[model samples]
Target: AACAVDAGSVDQTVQLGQVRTASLAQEGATSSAVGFNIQLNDCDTNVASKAAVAFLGTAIDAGHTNVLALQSSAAGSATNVGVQILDRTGAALTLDGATFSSETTLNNGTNTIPFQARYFATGAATPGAANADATFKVQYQGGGGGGANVVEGKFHVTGGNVTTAA
Candidate 1:
């Protein structure tokens, strides 16, 4: 029998925690001070992997100023609110739907990746629900060099909203 490799599952809920929108109202605002962490378990041993993340749907608006809209239609859903994901060093990761180099390689145990989630206002948008979501995809190459294996998981934002005063 051929040897089987086990690539494990990710922890449910990569929580971005709670963020207040009064801080994000300014132009080019970010929530670097308040970021989140994600963990993956049961990864293949001795393999190398790279991960990237992207918002699941189209951005809220058109042109360069567009923001990623909330994917849910639940109550408190707000318009003109967008989210941004950043790397460990506080650099903006590309939401263009491509994998970028992650902070670590795959191990037999668990791996953790640190990131930041920020809500931004594109224009004079009103304050409301600021929930959003994205998918994290990992591409890995086995030690024997067959091909890249892909795994995916979901993450979300909650307890976030913009204030009308801001």
Candidate 2:
């Protein structure tokens, strides 16, 4: 393997905190942005390269390609609400498996890439729990050992406990 990410590192969950229902008065509303990272470790020193994490998931709907709807099957799952994965600059990413954050220089030892996430309102939300999860494809490319060659790894990202108040 060209690199290794501990299961404990990127497998951990993210807590998006609380959101007030009233604040999500209509469609296209969004809560406070929370920041996080998908870490890379023990990378190969055999060559220098850049890396990026591409988020992948089934989108909520045709109009909301960036939203990952509540995973809870219960009736109490927050309605008209979902989670949005964003880049470090707070821009939502397309969960279609293609869009990715800007590539960052990779070091031989450790590297931390930045990303953000938040609650997005598809409509007036009902008070309940909001949760979501998605997969990521981490790629390392553009290096001396094989500039045209690349290495990839798979991982998951999850967030929950985003309470919505009425």
Candidate 3:
């Protein structure tokens, strides 16, 4: 009698698999100077900051604009915030009519202020697709120049599977 040797099986292996998180390969910078600034839904240990400029290369060629309302927590002093869009070369794109407001401190962690920006639409329809490389930045100004005065970060706008909200 001979034993059966199953070296390379014909069936696909589906037992243990690997998982990974969604991350980009590029990096960005934050500052209190005349560079990109602003952040949305940023709960990290960093101080108050802003998100200003964004860039989605030619691969994602599309354009539209919408109103974006934003507000900051009011604990420190009053400040101003806004958002803008730029080309890959960092040139300011003509505003089709966007709106924004100065940063205001929240009261009792329940103070809800309102700010607005025209969400200019333009980008590829999917992530990693041809012409889908994009970047979003926020900018913030004013805060008494201490205790987390200003901050900035980068975000990617991708064209991927989209599900409309109800």
Candidate 4:
């Protein structure tokens, strides 16, 4: 769980919460855990890389790993700035596994330079036990100016919650 805000113009803050892991075992046993993370981009330069926390579940603990990537693109206007996430090797994931949010886009508002993007995944339960890994890639372009316009980061999950076997 993580939240990224554009603190360039105004100090940004928000409350983000999500159910990352949950399961059932036996007949009356159940357990679950959620993820939490926070990121702040001062936009002091071109590319921005911040620090945050990430958690993994039992499926990933066994051997599975989740790869997270970030990409960005910008034009003369706010709408021109676009971000996307691809598989470890370079592939696009659907909205089902990903979600998008923003504050300075064309529709949102017209700004010379708009900066925002994030990617995360939720795990599912399997019979007995199981594990899986997914890689992520990101591309960013701060055409306005600044070499730091492009940046990248990553995280993984392990040891998940257990619940009644179903």
Q: Evaluated with lDDT, which candidate comes out highest? A: 2
- Which run of 10 residues does model 3 get worst, by summed lDDT? 12-21
Q: How displaced is residue 88 in candidate 1, in Å?
A: 1.6
Which lDDT tens digits does candidate 3 get at residues 10-53? Answer: 11111111111121111121111122223233222234332223
Query: How many pairs in model 3 have backbone atoms within 3 A of each other, for residues 3 or more apart or on separate chains, i.e. clashes?
Result: 33
- Candidate 1 lDDT, tens digit per residue, 37-133? 5555655554545333332435666642224566655566655557766667666555545635355454565666677767665644455667766
Residue pairs with colliding backbones in model 2 are: none
lDDT of 2 by residue, 1-166 (tens): 3466645544556777778888776898888877777777787757646766677777778899998867765656778878888876677888887787777777887878788778888888887767777877766665543332233333333444434445
Candidate number with the higher lDDT (2 or 4): 2
lDDT of 4 at 30: 24
Comparison by lDDT, 1 against 4, better one: 1
| Cα distance off (Å), candidate 1, residue 122 | 1.9
Candidates 1 and 2, the one with greater lDDT: 2
Candidate 4 local lDDT, 1-166, one digit each (tens): 0112333322221111221123221222223222222233433322322221112212212222222221211311111111122222222223222221222211121122222122223233222211122222222223433122122233222222222233
lDDT of 3 at 114: 28
Task: Give the poorly placed runs of model 3, Cα more than 4 Å off.
Answer: 1-101, 108-151, 160-166
